[PDB]
Amino acid sequence: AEVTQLSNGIVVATEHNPSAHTASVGVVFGSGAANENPYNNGVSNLWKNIFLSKENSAVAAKEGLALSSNISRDFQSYIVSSLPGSTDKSLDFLNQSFIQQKANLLSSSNFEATKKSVLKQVQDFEENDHPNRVLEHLHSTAFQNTPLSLPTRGTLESLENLVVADLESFANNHFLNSNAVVVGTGNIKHEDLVNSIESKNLSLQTGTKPVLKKKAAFLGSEVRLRDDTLPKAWISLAVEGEPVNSPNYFVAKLAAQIFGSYNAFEPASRLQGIKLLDNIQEYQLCDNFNHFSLSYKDSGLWGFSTATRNVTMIDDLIHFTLKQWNRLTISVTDTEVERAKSLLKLQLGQLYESGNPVNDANLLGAEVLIKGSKLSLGEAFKKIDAITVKDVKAWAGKRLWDQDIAIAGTGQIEGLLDYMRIRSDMSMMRW
Amino acid sequence: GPPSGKTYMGWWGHMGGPKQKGITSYAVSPYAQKPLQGIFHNAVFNSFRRFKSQFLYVLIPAGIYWYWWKNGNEYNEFLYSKAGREELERVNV
Q: Looking at the partner chain, which of B24, B27, B32 has a beta carbon nearest the beta carbon of A225?
């Protein structure tokens, strides 16, 4: 299905899908925002946004190419998608303006306009988008003083000290042949992509990226960005979870799928088979929740996020969901595991098997970059079907039962109790 | 029951302080900390700082009242001695 080969310096990965009507090539590097200082934080955002400038994207639009890019913790990608007959126009564009001739992109009077719009973008992020900024603050307090603690968008105080020297320094240090996968999704075939990446003699750079002196360590902590002038209360709360290439990767995904997501205002979201709903529905404790299992290279996160307007009963919402977490160690049933198996297979099928080949390019690039190949969906389903109740109980006794947590909150979180009551909720006194 | 009068302390969520903006608080798990950190430094330097700040207020009235009590005790011991009877009669009546 996926095929992956290694050229003179570049690894190439394709997912050919002959019933698609767009093809999409690009390059996925292996250094997201986890490879920055607290002082050049926001360099990858500036590279994402100078790759998508108006004068860089006008050249792609005249040839019928649509640009896309993504900054994450581990990886970063730069994707050019077009019609199936014009894959080499895309490879030519990605070469001649991003890979080799990046001196017109890094023009001053282009850098200034892009830096100004990125500053405006993160300023409107930091004061209007409340669930995502507390997920970023959960990351920045769970992994503090380690490289995984950095926001992917950067920081308004960090971003206004950046110059073009920092962008080209990061480019020299990280945009390398040893760090990059060239991806192709859509109905581009593999032999045509390798034949046109050896037809042009495409070479990115020849160094090797710096290796970080400390690994990401989970520190049980809290942060409270309280603001009484906001309507709701947004609370994210997580334990240390599994990183990628765990053996407990799918067990963590399944254990997050057991408690699922919920929306108070959708009538078929109130009828789910979660036993948390018939504790939080009687007094309408929350508006929504979602249980996540975020996996990175070094470490991971496992927890939930809620937004609620019932600011008087936040502590009972937290108490009821953590007493529902305890059942994974003690008394999780057969049925909850089977239901979460079916829902997890559906969620992974909707994530991978989707029509958009930009998303397939991002997923294939990050997966092949971190473990050298890509696990198929049939093998993923055969690894999900093999999970038992004892695997969930063993994983929850390891990672959940009586462990330190990380909390982040904004809004009206006066009703949220301190660290120690919430942490003492993580293990019940066997009743 | 009925609601009672207006108080100066609500509950969790509606305490009754002012609105708070721009204050961020950070804290670490005690399971990741060292309790008894700095006890041998605070036991000698912080103790001396607190004593130096708050000892004239306690020990000047203590000195006044203890000197008054000792002086009255010495006078009562003198008055009921053989050497001080001849003041004791002209003192009491």
A: B24
Q: What is the CA radius of gyration of chain A?
A: 23
- ∠ CA A408-A414-A399, nearest 5°, is 35
**B28: closest CA of chain A, how far (Å):** 4
User: Do the chains contact at A312 and B12, CB–CB below 8 Å?
Assistant: yes
DSSP string, B3-70: -----S---TT--------S-EEEEE-GGGS-TTTTHHHIIIIIHHHHHHHSSHHHHHHHHHHHHHHH
Nearest CA in chain A to B25: A224
Q: Contacts from A193-198 at CB under 8 Å and sequence distance 24+?
A: A193/A12, A193/A14, A193/A25, A193/A87, A194/A5, A194/A7, A194/A12, A196/A87, A196/A88, A196/A91, A197/A7, A197/A10, A197/A12, A197/A91, A198/A7
| CA pair distance A388, A238, nearest whole angstrom | 24
Nearest CA in chain A to B16: A414
Q: What's at B34, amino acid-wise?
A: K
- The resolution in Å comes to 2.8
Are B32 and A404 within 8 A, CB to CB?
yes
Q: Which residues pair with A406 in a beta bridge?
A: A221, A238
Identify all chain B residues contacting A418, using CB atoms and an 8 Å cutoff.
27
How was this entry determined?
cryo-EM
CB contact under 8 A, B13 and A227: no
CA distance B14 to chain A (A): 7
Asked if B12 lies within 8 A of A315 by C-beta distance, the reply is: yes
Q: Rounded to 10 degrees, what is the CA torsion of B31, B33, B36, B39? A: -170
Domain ranges of chain B: 1-93
Distance CA A147, CA A36 (A): 7
- Find the residue in B nearest to A418 (Cα): B27
Query: Is A185 in a helix, a strand, or coil?
Result: strand
Angstrom distance (rounded) from CA A150 to CA A33: 6
Cβ–Cβ < 8 Å for A266, A259:
no
Which residues pair with residue B25 across a beta bridge?
A224
Domains of chain A listed by start with CATH number: 1-202 (3.30.830.10), 208-431 (3.30.830.10)
Domain B1-93: what homologous superfamily? Cytochrome b-c1 complex subunit 8 (1.20.5.210)
The shortest CB-CB distance from B32 to any of A219, A313, A414 is to A219
How far is the C-alpha of A216 from the C-alpha of A226, rounded, in Å?
27
Residues of chain B with C-beta less than 8 angstroms from the C-beta of A226: 20, 23-25
The burial of A193, by beta-carbon neighbours within 10 Å (0-12 exposed, 13-18 middle, 19 or more buried), is given as: buried
Dmax (CA) of chain A: 69
Interface residues from chain A to B (CB-CB < 8 Å): 141, 219-229, 311-315, 404-405, 412, 414-415, 417-420, 423
Min Cα separation A306/chain B (Å): 16
CA distances in angstroms from B35 to A217, B30, B38, listed in the order given: 21, 8, 9
